[PDB]
Amino acid sequence: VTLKESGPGLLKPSQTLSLTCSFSGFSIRTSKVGVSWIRQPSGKGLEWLAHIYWDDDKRYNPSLESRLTISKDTSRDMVFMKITSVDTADTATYYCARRGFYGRKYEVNHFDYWGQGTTLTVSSAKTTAPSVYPLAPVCGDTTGSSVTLGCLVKGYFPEPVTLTWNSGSLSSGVHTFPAVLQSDLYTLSSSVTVTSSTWPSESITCNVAHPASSTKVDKKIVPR
Amino acid sequence: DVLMTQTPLSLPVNLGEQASISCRSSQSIVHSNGHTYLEWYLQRPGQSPKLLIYQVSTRFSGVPDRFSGSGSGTDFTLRISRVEAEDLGVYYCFQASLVPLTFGAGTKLELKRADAAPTVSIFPPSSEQLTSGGASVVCFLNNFYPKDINVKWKIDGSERQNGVLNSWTDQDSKDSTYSMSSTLTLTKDEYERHNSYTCEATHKTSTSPIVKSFNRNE
């Protein structure tokens, strides 16, 4: 038994989301399993959206129901979800979950199989290259035994970027933070901590690639 | 609708110890058909949720017997007898008796370790950003434990709540600490109006505020 969700990946606000869940390894028709859609918004837990029974009866979460339509095509072994008028808050991973049971105990049902999910980001942005900015300390903050440097990767779309330090040779003492979507664009940052004897006497460079915009930028961290 | 309240929301443990997670529903989730549809799901880091327990106390096939579910009506408990590395992740209780079906907020079962103070570092805007018309100030708070931390920006002594973008790392796989990045973004003109920039943190490892500052003119 496998479940596979498909979705557009990116939408602009106000568009309609069309999701598909495709089942393998059993028959929706024969099994009479119910199917739900469940989502996980960015930085939140799980939320149940909608469920469809074998006979096409449906149930919805009132919080979103007015925007939701669930449907199925048994002959294709597929279940569908439409969500109208998407906006930023619909940025989430969408899971298809089978409400299976061990035969023939229809009443002892539960979400036994979940797919890998399909992620959606909702943004008005077109492809946008990041601005990459070196973060050097003020002079007072370079008097100790270590120094922390950083790199700010601001205002790009879509994900991902790849950030490395000295072309990947500098890996210890690095913290690269997950990207965050805000005002329709992503921002990411990374810090690296090295000995005071290392920098600024040796060079430290942030390397940033954003494949969607075909950009690659190296920013040397230079003392103020 | 049925609120599902899990306690605690964060549960640090040592591998090999017992763990206990409580789930309270706001009303009875005994269904008219006689069954109580209370389920427990585990989402391991970077994976899909998986079923652990159904009908309050029945383990799903493949789930080890160190897991046990108990309770009745509104009062439910998940116990793990001896926590293993594959058990770490977020645990959700879930009721499927009443519509909307509802999850708890999730309980993160995480590795315990000794407290550690953040290494805090603050960064003025880069020359490059300033020339473009913007001004971001960045504060890193690195390698701290526990995860609970309050970060405040102050500009000329006044708290700045707006224009902030925060990001957090997941618990470190080797040293089990957390790190945070906070970016306060202004216009160049706003940045040039003000003098002192401060990143202030409250964490249990210090009896006083953890402060890093700079003056724009220095």
Binding site: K32, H51, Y53, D57, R59, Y106, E107, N109 | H31, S32, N33, H35, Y37, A96, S97, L98, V99, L101
Partner: peptide, 7 residues
Amino acid sequence: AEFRHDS
């Protein structure tokens, strides 16, 4: 409103 469970 109760969720439907078949028998």
